[PDB]
Amino acid sequence: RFLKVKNWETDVVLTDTLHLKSTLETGCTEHICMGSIMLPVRTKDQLFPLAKEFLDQYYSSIKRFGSKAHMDRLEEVNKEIESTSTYQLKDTELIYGAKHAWRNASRCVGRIQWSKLQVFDARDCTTAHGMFNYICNHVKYATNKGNLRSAITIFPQRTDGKHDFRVWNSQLIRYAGYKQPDGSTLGDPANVQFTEICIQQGWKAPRGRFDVLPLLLQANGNDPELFQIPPELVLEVPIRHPKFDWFKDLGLKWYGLPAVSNMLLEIGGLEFSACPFSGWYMGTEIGVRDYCDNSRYNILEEVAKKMDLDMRKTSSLWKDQALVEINIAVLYSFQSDKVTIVDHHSATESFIKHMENEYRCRGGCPADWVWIVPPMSGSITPVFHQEMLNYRLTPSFEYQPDPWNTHVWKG
Amino acid sequence: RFLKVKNWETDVVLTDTLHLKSTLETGCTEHICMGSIMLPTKDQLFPLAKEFLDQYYSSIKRFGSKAHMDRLEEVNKEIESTSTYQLKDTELIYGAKHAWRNASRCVGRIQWSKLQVFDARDCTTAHGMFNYICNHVKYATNKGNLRSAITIFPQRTDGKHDFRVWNSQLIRYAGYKQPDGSTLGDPANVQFTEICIQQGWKAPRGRFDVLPLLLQANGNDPELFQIPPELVLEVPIRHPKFDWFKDLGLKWYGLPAVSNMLLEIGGLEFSACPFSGWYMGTEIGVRDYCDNSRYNILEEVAKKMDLDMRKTSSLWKDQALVEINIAVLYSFQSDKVTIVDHHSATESFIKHMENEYRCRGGCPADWVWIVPPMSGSITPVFHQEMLNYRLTPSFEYQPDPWNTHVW
Ligand code: HEM
Ligand code: HEM
Ligand SMILES: CC(C)(C)ONC(=N)/N=C/CC[C@H](N)C(=O)O
Ligand SMILES: CC(C)(C)ONC(=N)/N=C/CC[C@H](N)C(=O)O
């Protein structure tokens, strides 16, 4: 079966055959579309087919399908599964797998870069202090003094589900949030619960508006331990505006390295529950979502006030005006400090070229429109006008429950 | 089978049960989501009529009453005898209001119960269609105080006597390709404009020419008619702070009136059912003005503002976009023509969704269409999970009649 997608701006039609290789479910049926829903211990039984599927994919990628080397590796993995009930990936397969999980990540607009990912193998790690050291190294390598380099660090895979490696932080670098007794929040409201955990674990909080959170790291199913990332390793950018000189007096800054640390990487049926990965920011992530969501720093009012916009009626589009100015400031600030950032026009234009390339060479590109379209100026970006098909390919990044909801405390 | 939708800004969770009555299919499967794709007999008819009459009698609290049974009996008799049936006025009005209520792509549905339904099932000629349409235009326009309306022409019979309005909206601007290679007027309408010219329209060959109506009665060849200019309320576009903005010479029409969809009620198909409400500002200022394949005016506006257009990261497009949209709203408001901004409309839709969840058990909604085409995440609909499913009565797409019609 072939499926066609059309761009309604250009009339370019593309044909998808890659969706035939999709195995996992979407959440949708013939009777309900769940496309806007945010979120819609294995036996040998299920493990060998998943491993075989993966190694067939790997050996095809390297022009070695059906080779002696291919056959010997299936045999070796099969015996390892029946003998030990799991298996170990070769380094080459781990690299291939991690790059493909990114290539397959349908919510990711940055995937033109997928083949340039630095994979750090941390599968020899055994303790939280060991995890801390690997994570400092990733941050320093990825940051590269502002010339950001995409990277992933991969800790040991799940075994019995009782010995999991987890990074409890949702990102390696994030700011603390504090709920005040009057009901207001200081800092980032998204991180209040996590910040309360850290404090309970013994972090002494500076209690300001941009406190970089400590790492909370669980090795081998043990209780997590706290570590402060060396401040000299945390690159930050003070936010100012090219024309408005009062903008700096808002006291805003943000960190340069966006590093997702709470997802699960699945490769060939193996589950890597700690696999922090990092790229670089698209400006709207900070300027639209982190600053202007009502449930985040919520700075629209204060900015619009300073601009003396007409705030008595929404139809003045005061929020829209302030929104654009904030986003100019974020891009200006990062570019001026020589910290890698991409604007939403450049990023979406690149994605469309990536997507067309993938259709030609791969037969498809799964993509989640809801996530790919930027949270401001949607229809003046080419992706708004592009029909996409969303389906799930493995290797993949997957959500997993927050570890505080499932952890068995040792004491 | 019982489904939750969460708002991520407010944490409010709603439970959807209404989807279980979903009839038509979505295009999606368990393997693939098609959420962003724009267009994914006697024995057939009786269950459809029954399903509809059942929800109708339920709505007037008369389910299982004799009057309910008797109507079902009568229609069954009528289908058996005539192969079709005729809706009572009460059913027709209920059906059209509900087709709007069920429109998953419509952010304006808080208004769904206030719909003036004009029964045109007695219409027989293109001239009668023109008459009904002028009356709808004048009624809905109401000197700028717009009122929602639908006009319903006769239902499909054997399918070779279809009533159709060939136009995609009652009021739109012409488009002409030039020797230049550029396009004058609205490029969306270039093809329909050619069809009009080939049918005999003398086009005045300008940027904002109101197109003539091309009306097909009774499967006959369609015919041209000019809407009385005095019935077409238009708005010149100026800006509350930029004096040069009026120099661009932009205008738009006050009445958005979709005229190419098919209304399905109780299995009956109404192939000509033009309907109208009023504009949300972004439809004109973001889509009609700034789409690359529409009037595409961002470049000209940015220049006049003297923005740095050397690099995408200055956000010059985004800046001009906001200004264009301020100017659309200001202009309609100044001229006392109903318009709604995207903040107000989306806020209303959230309130409507809650009402529907509470009173009906859900609200089919298509997030891809509901979230405005600018400033998505600063509107509350961005953060609201929505379930998309197909309920009937419904408005459906149908093929353009020039691809179907036999001359
Ligand atoms: C290279 C620079 C990159 C840019 C500009 C980029 C851009 C983005 C953006 C804007 C989102 C949506 C984020 C949000 O709204 O929270 C995203 C999601 C995602 N990206 Fe990329 N990305 C990049 C690199 C990567 C890398 C290196 C990986 C993994 C190796 C990755 C995997 C994903 C995944 C798994 C998601 C979905 C996360 C979720 O569901 O919350 N990205 N990316
Ligand atoms: C009262 C004022 C109304 C407002 C502000 C409103 C708002 C909108 C908006 C912004 C769209 C998306 C249009 C587009 O992007 O092309 C839409 C689509 C839709 N609306 Fe409403 N609407 C209103 C009245 C109505 C009425 C009176 C009906 C039917 C009786 C209706 C049925 C629909 C349908 C069927 C669509 C989807 C059409 C398509 O797929 O192209 N609307 N509406
Ligand atoms: C971590 C990752 C995906 C590799 O980098 N990509 C990226 N630009 N952003 C991902 C999430 C960042 C999040 N939106 C934030 O604003 O902190
Ligand atoms: C009833 C009706 C016609 C849907 O009104 N709704 C509306 N505000 N617009 C719908 C389509 C109009 C189209 N987006 C336009 O910008 O011309």
Ligand SMILES: C[C@H](O)[C@H](O)[C@H]1CNc2nc(N)[nH]c(=O)c2N1
């Ligand atoms: C409910 C809805 O799916 C949710 O708000 C999504 C919308 N699209 C998004 N897109 C991106 N990139 N990131 C997000 O957090 C979201 N949030």
Ligand SMILES: C[C@H](O)[C@H](O)[C@H]1CNc2nc(N)[nH]c(=O)c2N1
């Ligand atoms: C490809 C994509 O589905 C298409 O561009 C849609 C996106 N969302 C939309 N939303 C509305 N309200 N109107 C539209 O025309 C579209 N176009």
Ligand SMILES: [Zn+2]
């Ligand atoms: Zn779907």
